[PDB]
């Protein structure tokens, strides 16, 4: 009901860092017979429940099936990658008001073998 959004991770060991990439989203709620929405994804990076680094894509105006290829990197010793957990949201822009978020979910790190490059699309979920 409120879109899903495909990313990928990956961990840059020449640099220490992981790879975060916002691919796109797709079948985002419109809020009027017939309308749009603004979106941008802001990612946070926690460490149990304590929130530590923030991103934030470009908007892509007026569009359900926004499509970034944007990528943003943490640094983080990959023996810490494990501790951690993602947060994707999903916002609306407006000029005036608040920008409402369209939905979010989480990725816990623990259980990913960073010998990989994930990727997935993941359902958004009321904020």
């Given at each position: 009901k409120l879109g899903k959004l495909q990313y990928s991770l990956d961990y840059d060991f020449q640099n220490n860092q992981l790879l975060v990439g916002i691919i796109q989203a797709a079948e985002l709620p419109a809020l009027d017979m017939g309308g749009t929405s603004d979106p941008y994804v802001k990612i946070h990076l926690m460490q149990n429940g304590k929130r530590l680094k923030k991103k934030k894509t470009t908007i892509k105006k007026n569009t359900l099936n926004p499509v970034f290829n944007e990528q943003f990197t943490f640094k983080v010793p990959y023996s810490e990658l494990g501790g951690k957990t993602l947060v994707m949201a999903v916002y609306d822009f407006d000029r005036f008001s608040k920008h409402d978020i369209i939905g979010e979910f989480k990725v816990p790190?623990?259980?990913?073998?960073?010998?990989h490059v994930t990727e997935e699309w993941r359902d958004l979920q009321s904020a």
């Amino acid at each position: 009901k409120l879109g899903k959004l495909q990313y990928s991770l990956d961990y840059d060991f020449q640099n220490n860092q992981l790879l975060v990439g916002i691919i796109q989203a797709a079948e985002l709620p419109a809020l009027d017979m017939g309308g749009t929405s603004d979106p941008y994804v802001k990612i946070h990076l926690m460490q149990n429940g304590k929130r530590l680094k923030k991103k934030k894509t470009t908007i892509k105006k007026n569009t359900l099936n926004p499509v970034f290829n944007e990528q943003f990197t943490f640094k983080v010793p990959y023996s810490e990658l494990g501790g951690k957990t993602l947060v994707m949201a999903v916002y609306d822009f407006d000029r005036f008001s608040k920008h409402d978020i369209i939905g979010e979910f989480k990725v816990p790190m623990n259980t990913v073998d960073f010998g990989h490059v994930t990727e997935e699309w993941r359902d958004l979920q009321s904020a």
